[PDB]
Design a binder for this molecule. Structure first.
Ligand code: W2V
Length: 165
């Protein structure tokens, strides 16, 4: 199972790790994708997870969108985890670079509560434009299930741990 994590709270754990490499190693029941409403996995975590599936995630996602239409900002859907996990929970955090309401970040993290344990990135961080320190705070104050956070950047990981209240 999960190794080398720092325990932040009763249920939140954090590690400086590449979430693709972490998913390939652990093969968790659920890996969270930092999705957009269209499930267009172009960059950031989504681009990396999709590339690790050899584009199978994007093909499955395009069929999901063709059937169901776009997700809501703050929403999610469960799709296959392909070669990375049993399932992928595609969660849409607000993209500050698109002018989306940061208050939807709590709604986005509430999707994690439907799964007992997840491997996840910080929602709305990175190319989504939000402050990762704030994202971690909302995560610990919203998620009650066991969440193993993978933070790609070592420098950001150190800043998140050193500033954690
Ligand atoms: C391959 O995934 C990456 C690659 C680069 C950056 C990120 C984001 C994900 C959101 O939190 C902040 C960043 C981080 O983890 O350091 C993810």
């Amino acid at each position: 199972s999960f190794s080398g994590y720092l325990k932040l709270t009763d249920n939140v754990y954090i590690k400086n790790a590449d979430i693709v490499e972490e998913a390939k190693k652990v093969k968790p029941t659920v890996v969270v994708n930092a999705a957009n409403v269209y499930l267009k996995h172009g960059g950031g975590v989504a681009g990396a997870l999709n590339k690790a599936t050899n584009n199978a995630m994007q093909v499955e996602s395009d069929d999901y969108i063709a059937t169901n239409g776009p997700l809501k900002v703050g929403g999610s859907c469960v799709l296959s985890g392909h070669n990375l996990a049993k399932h992928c929970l595609h969660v849409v955090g607000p993209n500050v670079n698109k002018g989306e309401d940061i208050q939807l970040l709590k709604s986005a993290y509430e999707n994690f509560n439907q799964h007992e344990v997840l491997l996840a990135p910080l929602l709305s961080a990175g190319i989504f434009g939000a402050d990762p320190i704030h994202s971690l705070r909302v995560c610990v104050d919203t998620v009650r299930t066991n969440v193993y956070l993978a933070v790609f950047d070592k420098n950001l990981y150190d800043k998140l741990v050193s500033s954690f209240l």
